DNA sequence: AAAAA
């Protein structure tokens, strides 16, 4: 039997169902953009579950005993099953609204709100947008548009590993004990991302250091001339709060990587790479290290199967349980896992 | 408002 949970199965990047599931994933996209809150989290619920699959669907027959599977979700899989296609899936990649909301929010520094402002306004086009003159941008959006070409080039993992030094090198000048730990997409096995994350923690820095921690490696990358942009965002962490972004002091950075850092197979001797630095209390590690992990459906499931089925709270800094009115400690993921009464999941088995 | 796992 396959749960509803997407912390109770395992989803490794072998998706034999991508037909259906890049259809789902279109139509969930497009009741995000739409405001449908309810139709977007069926069709992500359908996509996630057959994600799990270690087989293609082929016939309706297959669909039995799958979960989440609601009657409309059935419908788009009987005519991708008929001729290979989703009509429902293909008239969204049609959309004028889809379309634009998709291009605009591909730059750094759009959100909803500005994509929505420019497709009222009669703006189709970037090329429009960016030579317009009584359009005003916010830095994070001039940034998206300097660096645009390579940010929405795939990040690679030679790319993520070149990062990774960097972020290293940077960090252990200011906390040689800190403990410096690739997140996100990478961490799950993913060759590819938009970015690269890293959650950072040091089992001996105080309060004080660690809020500096971040404003001396940006500073250290200012000087070097490495510092594309750079927003660091101050901690509104509660050691003593119940479970409920996350409240850890972070920052969303464009960082100057250069070719000569890539030890990879492969004109500016350089490339933009969007990168994630979060910084956490010691204690808190492995709580950072799951919500940061992912996907975005396995900590949603964490979360619901927490509450929905064992009384307990759960979210990036702590784990609480109701029942017994106590906070659960955790020096690792598989901690929490056996906290929550669950077979532990590898993080390349959480692709949900 | 946007950045996010
Ligand atoms: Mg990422
Ligand atoms: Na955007
Ligand atoms: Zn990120």
Request: aromatic fraction near 10%.
């Amino acid at each position: 039997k396959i749960s509803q949970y997407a912390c109770q199965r395992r989803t490794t990047l072998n998706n034999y169902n991508q037909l259906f599931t890049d259809a789902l994933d279109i139509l969930a996209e497009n009741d995000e953009l739409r405001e449908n809150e309810g139709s977007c989290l069926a069709f992500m619920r359908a996509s996630s579950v057959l994600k799990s699959l270690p087989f293609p669907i082929t016939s309706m027959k297959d669909t039995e005993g799958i979960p989440c599977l609601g009657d409309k979700v059935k419908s788009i899989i009987e005519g991708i099953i008929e001729d290979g296609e989703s009509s429902e899936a293909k008239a969204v990649l049609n959309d004028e609204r889809y379309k634009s909301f998709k291009l605009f929010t591909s730059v750094f520094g759009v959100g909803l709100k500005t994509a929505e402002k420019w497709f009222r306004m009669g703006f189709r086009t970037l090329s429009k947008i960016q030579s317009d003159k009584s359009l005003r941008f916010t830095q994070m959006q001039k940034a998206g548009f300097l660096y645009y070409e390579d940010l929405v080039s795939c990040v690679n993992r030679p790319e993520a590993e070149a990062v990774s030094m960097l972020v290293k090198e940077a960090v252990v000048t200011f906390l040689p004990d800190a403990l410096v730990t690739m997140t996100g997409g990478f961490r799950r096995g993913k060759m590819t991302g938009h970015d690269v994350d890293f959650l950072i923690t040091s089992p001996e820095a105080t309060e004080d250091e660690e809020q500096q921690l971040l404003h001396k490696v940006t500073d250290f990358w200012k000087q070097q001339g490495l510092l594309l942009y750079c927003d660091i965002l101050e901690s509104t962490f509660e050691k003593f709060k119940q479970p409920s972004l996350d409240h850890f002091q972070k920052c969303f950075l464009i960082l100057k990587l250069d070719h000569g850092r890539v030890h990879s197979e492969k004109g500016k001797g350089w490339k933009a790479i969007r990168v994630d630095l979060v910084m956490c209390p010691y204690d808190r590690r492995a709580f950072a290290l799951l919500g940061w992990t992912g996907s975005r459906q396995f900590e949603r499931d964490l979360r619901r199967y927490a509450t929905h089925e064992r009384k307990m709270m759960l979210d990036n800094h702590a784990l609480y349980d109701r029942t017994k009115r106590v906070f659960l400690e955790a020096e690792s993921e598989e901690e929490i896992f056996a906290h929550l009464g669950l077979d532990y999941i590898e993080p390349w088995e959480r692709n949900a």
